[PDB]
UniProtKB/Swiss-Prot annotation, chains A, B, C, D, E, F, G, H, I, J, K:
Promotes microtubule assembly and stability, and might be involved in the establishment and maintenance of neuronal polarity. The C-terminus binds axonal microtubules while the N-terminus binds neural plasma membrane components, suggesting that tau functions as a linker protein between both. Axonal polarity is predetermined by TAU/MAPT localization (in the neuronal cell) in the domain of the cell body defined by the centrosome. The short isoforms allow plasticity of the cytoskeleton whereas the longer isoforms may preferentially play a role in its stabilization. Changing N24H: In FTD1; reduced the ability of tau to promote microtubule assembly without having a significant effect on tau filament formation; effects at both the RNA and the protein level. It comes from Homo sapiens (Human). Glycans are attached at K8, K9, K75, K81. The gene is MAPT. This is Microtubule-associated protein tau. It is found in: Cytoplasm, Cytosol; Cell membrane; Cytoplasm, Cytoskeleton; Cell projection, Axon.
Amino acid sequence: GKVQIINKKLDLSNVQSKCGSKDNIKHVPGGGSVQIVYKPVDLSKVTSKCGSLGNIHHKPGGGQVEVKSEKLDFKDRVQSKIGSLDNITH
Amino acid sequence: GKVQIINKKLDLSNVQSKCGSKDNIKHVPGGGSVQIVYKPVDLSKVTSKCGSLGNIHHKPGGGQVEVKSEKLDFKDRVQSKIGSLDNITH
Amino acid sequence: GKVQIINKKLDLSNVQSKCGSKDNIKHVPGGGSVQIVYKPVDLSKVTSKCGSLGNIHHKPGGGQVEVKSEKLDFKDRVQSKIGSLDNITH
Amino acid sequence: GKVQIINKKLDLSNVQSKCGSKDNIKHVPGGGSVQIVYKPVDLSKVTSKCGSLGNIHHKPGGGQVEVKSEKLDFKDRVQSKIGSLDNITH
Amino acid sequence: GKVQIINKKLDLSNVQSKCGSKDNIKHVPGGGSVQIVYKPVDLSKVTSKCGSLGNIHHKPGGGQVEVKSEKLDFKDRVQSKIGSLDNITH
Amino acid sequence: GKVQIINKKLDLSNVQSKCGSKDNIKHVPGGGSVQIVYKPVDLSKVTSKCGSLGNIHHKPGGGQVEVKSEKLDFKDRVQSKIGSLDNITH
Amino acid sequence: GKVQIINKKLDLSNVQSKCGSKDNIKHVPGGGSVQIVYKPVDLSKVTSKCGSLGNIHHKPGGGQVEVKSEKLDFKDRVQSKIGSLDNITH
Amino acid sequence: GKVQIINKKLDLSNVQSKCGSKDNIKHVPGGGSVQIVYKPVDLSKVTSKCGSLGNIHHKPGGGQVEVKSEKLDFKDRVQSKIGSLDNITH
Amino acid sequence: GKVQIINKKLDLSNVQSKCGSKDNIKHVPGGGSVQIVYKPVDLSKVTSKCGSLGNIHHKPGGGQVEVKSEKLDFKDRVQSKIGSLDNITH
Amino acid sequence: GKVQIINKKLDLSNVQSKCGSKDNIKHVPGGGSVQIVYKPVDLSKVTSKCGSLGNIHHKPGGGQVEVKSEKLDFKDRVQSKIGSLDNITH
Amino acid sequence: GKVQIINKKLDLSNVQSKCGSKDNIKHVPGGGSVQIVYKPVDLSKVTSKCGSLGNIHHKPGGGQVEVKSEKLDFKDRVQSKIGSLDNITH
């Protein structure tokens, strides 16, 4: 007589990335050959709640069989180069 | 006699990326050959709640069979270069 | 006698990307050969609630068979170059 | 005697991309050969609620068979170049 | 005796892209050969609620057979170049 | 005795793209050979509720057979170039 | 004894594209050979509720057979070039 | 004894494209050879509720057979060029 | 004993394209050889409720056979060029 | 007589990355050939709640069999180089 | 007679990375050939709540069998180089 199962959840989770920089360049009075190269590669990435979540099952009977499988797989790559930069004065 | 199963969820999750920069360049009084190259590659990416979620099943009987499979797979790549930059004064 | 299953969900999730920059260039009093190249590649991307979600099933009887399969797969790539930039004064 | 299954959902989710920039260029008093190249490639992309969602099934009887399959697949790419930019004064 | 299944949903989801820029160029007092190239490639794209959604089925009897299949597939690409830009003063 | 299935949905979803720019060019006091090239390629695209949605089926009897298939497929591409731009003063 | 199935839907969804720009060019006091090329390629595109929607079926009997198939497919492309632009003063 | 199926729908969906620009050119005090080329290619396109929608079927009997097929397919392309533009002063 | 099927729909959908521009050119005080080329290619296109919609069928008997097929297909293309534009002063 | 199982959870977890920098460059009075290369590669990445979560099962009967499997797998890599940078005075 | 099991959890955990730097470069009065290369590679990464969490099971009967397996696996790598940097005075 009787069976029971329950659940409850809450999230208020914060998952920011790179969300508040203040980059800037200023004030060059000059007289000679100034040069700048600034922050030449930048990235951000966020991933959440992937895969199998929240499912419910009900399967009565003594003779049965069951099989399952799962996978998750993530990859990234980056490359960069800077050249023959030149300046002279007089 | 009787069976029961329940669920509940809430989300208020925040998943920002690169959401608040303040990039700028200013004030060049000059007299000589200034040059700048600024932030030449930039990216952001967000992914959420992929895969299998929230499903419900009900399958009574003792003789049965069951089989399942799943996968998730994500990839990215980036490349960059900077050249023969030149300046002279006088 | 009796079976039951239930569900409930809520979302208020925020999933922004690159949503608030303030890029600018200003004030060049001059007299010599200034040059700038600004932020030459930029991207953002968001993906959400893909795959199988929210399905409901009901399949009574002891002799049955069942089989399932799933996949998700995402890819990206980027390339960039900067040239023979030149300036002189006098 | 009896079976039951239920559901409920809500969304108020926000999924912005690049939604609020303030790009600008200003104030060139001159006297020498200024040059600028600004933000030469830009993109944004959003995708949501793809695949199989919200379906309901009901299939009584002990002798049956069942088979299913699914896929999702997304790809992107980008390329860029900058040339023989030149300036002189006097 | 009896079977039941139910559903309910709501959406108020927001899915903007590039929706609020403020691009501008201003104020050139001159005297020498100014040049500008501005933001030369720009894109945005949004896709939503694709695939199979909201279907309902009812199929009683023990001897049956069933088979299904699905796919989704999205692709994009972009290219750009900038030339032999030149300016002189005096 | 008895079977039942139900449904309900609502949408108030917003799916804008590029909906609010403020592009402009101004104020050239002159005296030397100014030149501009502005935003030379621009696009936006939106797609929604494609595929199979909202269908209802009812098919009693134990001996039957069933088969289904589906696909979705989207593609885009873009190219651009800028030339031998030239200016002189005096 | 008895079967039932139901449905209901609502939409108030908004699917704008490029709907509110404010492009303009102004104020050239002159004295030297100004030139401009403005926004030379522009597009927007929207597609909605394509495919199979809202169908209803009823097919009793145990001996039957059924087969179905579906497809959706969308493509676009764009190209652009800018020439030997020239100006002189004095 | 008895069968039933129902439906209901509503739409108030908005599907605008390029619906509110404010393009203009102004104020040229002159004295030297000004030239402009403005927005030389522009397009917008909207498509909605294509394919198979709203059909109803009723086909009792155990011995039958059924077969169906569907397709949708959309394509576009664009090209543009700008010439040997020239101006002189004095 | 008994069968029933029902339907209902409403639309108030809005499907505008390019519906509200404000293009204009003004104010040329002159003294030197001004020239303009304005917006030289423009298009808009809308398509709606194509294909098969609203049909109703009723076909009792166990021995029958059925076959169907459908297609939709849309295409567009555009090309443009600008010439040897020239102006002189004095 | 009777069985019971329960659950409850809460999250208020914060998962930031690189969220608050203040990068800047300033004040160059000049007279000799200054040069800078700034922060040329930058990244951040966040991943959360992947795998199998929140599932519920109920499977009575003494004769049965069960099998399961799972995997998670994440990878990244980065490369960078800096060139023949040169400056002279007098 | 009777069985019971319970659970409860809370999190307020903070999992920041690199969240508050203040990088800057300043004040170069000059007269000789200054050069700088700043922070040329930077990264941060966070991962949380991966694997199997929160599941509930109920499986009565004396004759049964059970088997399970799990894995988690994470990898990263980085490389960098700096070149033939040169400066002279007089």
